[PDB]
């Protein structure tokens, strides 16, 4: 619903002759998806990494603590891929990450 | 390239034509080491460790019985070139560990 409202506002701005960047601000969200988080860690963009403790198969995340240690990223193993899915509006998330936040946070 | 002689037999034989050089085909780039690939391979190597036959070969290299180690690597892997390359890689591993310690 939020994306639909943002798209309607951006379409209104385009119709009135303004770019979508004039009406929309830079977003700040958590990062999820295993390939995306691994890419962010390799590019050293992720500030904090949280890995679910119960990923089956375990090979998907068994290298992730070593990768975070080599890249110098703070990582933590947390209980609940369902608990991470509640963050990312899914049933299950294997790993989440923060790259950057707002100034008040 | 060496110009051909124009004769039917001998060294550099064949009909005389001016050879040109070609840009190297991207299908022939296979085997070249990539930065991400070697990074991933090093990470997986330190995560997974070694196979028991590699550990036996490392013990043989540590004791210095190089001929016995090469024979063991040949009878394990199957062929002489693979055995030699694996023994060289384990030389690199042992030298890295010794220079670390």
């Amino acid at each position: 619903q939020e994306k639909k409202e943002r798209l309607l506002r951006e379409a209104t701005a385009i119709k009135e002759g303004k770019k979508k960047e004039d009406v929309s601000k830079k977003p700040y969200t958590v990062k999820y998806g295993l390939n995306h988080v691994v890419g962010l860690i390799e590019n050293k963009k992720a500030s904090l990494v949280l890995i679910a403790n119960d990923v089956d198969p375990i090979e998907l995340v068994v290298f992730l603590p070593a990768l975070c240690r080599k890249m110098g990223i703070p990582y933590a193993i947390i209980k609940g891929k369902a608990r991470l899915g509640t963050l990312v509006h899914k049933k299950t998330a294997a790993v989440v990450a923060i790259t950057e936040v707002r100034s008040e946070d | 390239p060496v110009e051909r002689t124009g004769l039917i037999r001998g060294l550099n034989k064949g009909h005389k034509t001016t050879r040109r050089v070609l840009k190297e085909r991207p299908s022939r780039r296979k085997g070249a080491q990539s930065k991400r690939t070697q990074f991933v391979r090093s990470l997986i190597r330190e995560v997974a460790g070694l196979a028991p036959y590699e550990r036996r070969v490392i013990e043989l290299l540590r004791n210095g019985k190089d001929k016995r180690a090469r024979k063991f690597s040949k009878k394990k892997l199957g062929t002489f070139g693979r055995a030699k390359r694996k023994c060289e890689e384990l030389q690199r591993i042992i030298a890295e560990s010794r220079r670390a310690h």
Binding site: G39, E42, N43, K44 | K35, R36
Partner: peptide, 8 residues
């Protein structure tokens, strides 16, 4: 850093 490719 390790990169898969050059990006925009």
């Amino acid at each position: 850093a390790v990169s898969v490719r050059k990006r925009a």
